[PDB]
Amino acid sequence: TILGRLWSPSTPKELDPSARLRNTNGIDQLRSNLALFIAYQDMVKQRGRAEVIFSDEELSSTIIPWFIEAMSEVSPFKLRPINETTSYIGQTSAIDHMGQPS
Amino acid sequence: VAAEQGSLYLVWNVRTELRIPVGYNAIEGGSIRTPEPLEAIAYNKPIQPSE
Amino acid sequence: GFNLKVKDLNGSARGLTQAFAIGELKNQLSVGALQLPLQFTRTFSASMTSELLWEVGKGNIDPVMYARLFFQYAQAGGALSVDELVNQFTEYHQSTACNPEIWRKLTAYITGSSNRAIKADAVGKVPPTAILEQLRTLAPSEHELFHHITTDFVCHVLSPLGFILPDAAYVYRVGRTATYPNFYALVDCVRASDLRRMLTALSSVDSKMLQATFKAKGALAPALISQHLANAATTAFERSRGNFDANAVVSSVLTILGRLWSPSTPKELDPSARLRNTNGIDQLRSNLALFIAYQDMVKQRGRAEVIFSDEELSSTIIPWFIEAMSEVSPFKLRPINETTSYIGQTSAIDHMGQPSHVVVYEDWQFAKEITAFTPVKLANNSNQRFLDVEPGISDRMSATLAPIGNTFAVSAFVKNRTAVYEAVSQRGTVNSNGAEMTLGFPSVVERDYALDRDPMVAIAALRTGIVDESLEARASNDLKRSMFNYYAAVMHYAVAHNPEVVVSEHQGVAAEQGSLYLVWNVRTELRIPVGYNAIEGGSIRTPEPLEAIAYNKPIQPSEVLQAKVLDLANHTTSIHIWPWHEASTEFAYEDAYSVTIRNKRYTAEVKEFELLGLGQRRERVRILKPTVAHAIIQMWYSWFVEDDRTLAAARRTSRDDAEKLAIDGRRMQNAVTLLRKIEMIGTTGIGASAVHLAQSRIVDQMAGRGLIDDSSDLHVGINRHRIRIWAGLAVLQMMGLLSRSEAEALTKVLGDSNALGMVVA
Amino acid sequence: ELLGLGQRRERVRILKPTVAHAIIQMWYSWFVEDDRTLAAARRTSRDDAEKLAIDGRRMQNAVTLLRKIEMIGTTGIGASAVHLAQSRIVDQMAGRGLIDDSSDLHVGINRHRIRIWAGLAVLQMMGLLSRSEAEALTKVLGDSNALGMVVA
Amino acid sequence: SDLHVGINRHRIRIWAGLAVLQMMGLLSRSEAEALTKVLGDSNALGMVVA
């Protein structure tokens, strides 16, 4: 949610990732994978969409990402390039001379 | 809605296939971007895989 | 931009007259007894600007500022006899002089408890801040604090170091003042010279010495400081002590000088040669600034003269005003000429040759950056605070602003005014007799918007050409002053070109109404009736100006007198504004942005923040003003309006075909230009995105509705600009620039051509 | 968490502050009597000069105390409070409604207030004081009541 | 100067062209003037303006 709070708009709470942002400089990667996002939604349903960016674990400075799997490699989760994330799939289609398909 | 947001969520920018009807999800006059989803994945030229 | 018919001002802007300049009801304006050449050709004049910030944080003489505040007060009518106040003050000071035993005493505690008082101790003196106000208490409480300054004057001294600790500042920020001046203004400067001098002396300082002033020692020391204080005071006082004496008197000198000027005066109402000859006060006669200056005052005064020195005046006070010693009077020698240069003028003039419409124009810059600021408080329940500011937009917008800036010259105005022209078997000047003049001074008005008051009255002030109170006297004078300037350049300027430089006194409704002017010449040009004519052998002459300007021919300016406009406190860090709230506006904004195409209305609003990028609208975040441009905008705006109008009629009346036929196209052209202005600014990202937001949205509603995949088609341009244009218009709203009202109605009058240039087919 | 660390084992006993708690209680105490005397000294002052002497003598130095205290806010640990602090607040208005408020941190008064308090707070987990005893320092609040203009 | 404002030149020229149409009867009198009729603008096109 913190991060949530970064994708924004527009959440100028702190004026968005901010003062807390300034502790950071590791932030950088987190985001950068799609996979990463994916959890969020889970919260949305789950937590009904929780509240207050989890209290930031109260600023836990720079240390809890560093408990992640990318910083505590527990699961297969494979940083994998998007393109190759799969590809056994090709597309195929109809058309009536449409030329679109249907 | 509450909590207060509804997923910053995604869209794509297809325009690939031209003047096409497929649900209220568009048309997008001339130009096409488009938000949601399956169809867009329809909206390419078909292919083989590679995996 | 008062448009005026030659052969009347005495109605036309009734009281905006030389006559008025006498007061002079609507009599005279004549010729020609005696006549009397003088062309004093220099003035003492000033320069642009007098606004500033002036945060006080480490007061240390430098009058000016102060004085300026003084003026702000002086002006404020909460001071006026400011001077007087200084007396009061003098006395105040004096009373300072008188309570040493207190003062000291006070001091004595302030730091710090007295009688051994010695040594390197630890004397963490302070922000002294409050203390003072005790001292005020012990003092009396004359206006604001002078009092405090003075403190600072010792503070810093009192410190070698340590002996005052750290402090903050405030804000005050002088506003602007004149360009020309009057009398009262003069005397004070002189007095100011004292005052500054008073303070001049006042820093001075006594150093650190011994193992005392050096290494803190002596209760008896600072008992000596207090003495120092005294020393200061005294001295300060002393340098003060004789000097003050002459104010009305000065006027009188003027009156002498005047009475020199007078030249038909009684024999034993001469200034004897001993006078006449002496020092360069005589030079002083032959020094404009004044000349023009006196008279008026005297107009008020009806006359009166002190009678005094002939030997200190001559002329010692006289070059006590070596006037320019204050630059406060930035009435400082000018080769007269060197002004004007914000005047260009250009005119529309008929065939015979004979004239039409003369524009004197005012020449500007308008570059600007914004100033959109955090309005919070800091100080609750008390407003002198600093608040804050940030960019975000400010830059973005400004960045956009700049471009707009690009487009707009005064030059371009005039060009446009050129564009006005055309004429034909039309139109005068000789045909029907009254001739136009307009002088671009929206500027005045700007200030008025800055002064938040109704223009129309101003118009009235012209209109009647006199005072039209009803409402804030302050404002009124303010206006008045403007008007002074209004008179003020002009004839200099005219004269600058026109060294038709003589006098016959006009001697009002009789005889003793010493008002000097010259008629001016108009040399060639065979025949005109234009003016309450003379025509003095085809070489009309008048001490009434406008025409003369008419017998210029388009002069140029020679600077746009840039336009540096004050700004934020940047180093703002404590400090506190003073009138601000007025001076700030919230950016709310109402209105929208919608289109119905097909039959289907596509619809949106304004939703300011998001146009502005981030969230989220609220009462706060206020914005400093956008003044200049309003003045400008409307100009552009205003023009068209006439033109269609006037045109339309002419278009009507068309006694022949051709002409009618003729006029339009040109009228068409400009529109496109308009258009050109707008789309051009419509391109700007921050715009465009806005469009963006729109489109999507437009679409969104649309999406249910829309069904047909009709293709290319609206590659037919439209949209791009269409929207862009429109978008530009938003700019106008979201920086309220032009009202909702007018522009859409202008729009209204537009409606075509647009397919111009273009693909087609 | 004030350390910045949720919320470890919970099982630390700490070498205690034998020295300073006392030294401070000297300091402390030293201060504390003095005001009595000083007030008294003013009372027994029955002319201005003396009272006046008291003034500053009374004043400045306190804020100096403060000088210490904010100063000791300029530390990591002060900051830990502070950061933690505002933020939590921030949400409380913003998160709940009105967001019109950062400023509210940013006038001295409060600022300092929290800062101080916090600063004192530290001491309290440094044992030292008593909340009670701080409270008398809070009795310093009535006085002068000048206080906290400007900073930093 | 004024009718250095173009007009005439073309105006007439145009018109003149029309003569051609008559004097080699090309188009009848009727139609073309009525076409003319439906015309009536733009003409200030391109041009000096201003």
UniProtKB/Swiss-Prot annotation, chain A:
Q: Where in the cell is the protein located?
A: Virion
Counting on the full-length protein, the chain here runs from: 255 to 356 of 769
Q: What is this protein called?
A: Major inner protein P1
Gene source species: Pseudomonas phage phi6 (Bacteriophage phi-6)
* Lineage top rank: taxon: Viruses
What this protein is reported to do is described as: P1 is the major inner capsid (core) protein of the polyhedral procapsid, which is responsible for genomic replication and transcription. Forms a dodecahedral shell from 60 asymmetric dimers. Binds to RNA and may be involved in genomic packaging.
How this chain assembles, per its entry, is: Homodimer. Associates with the polymerase complex.
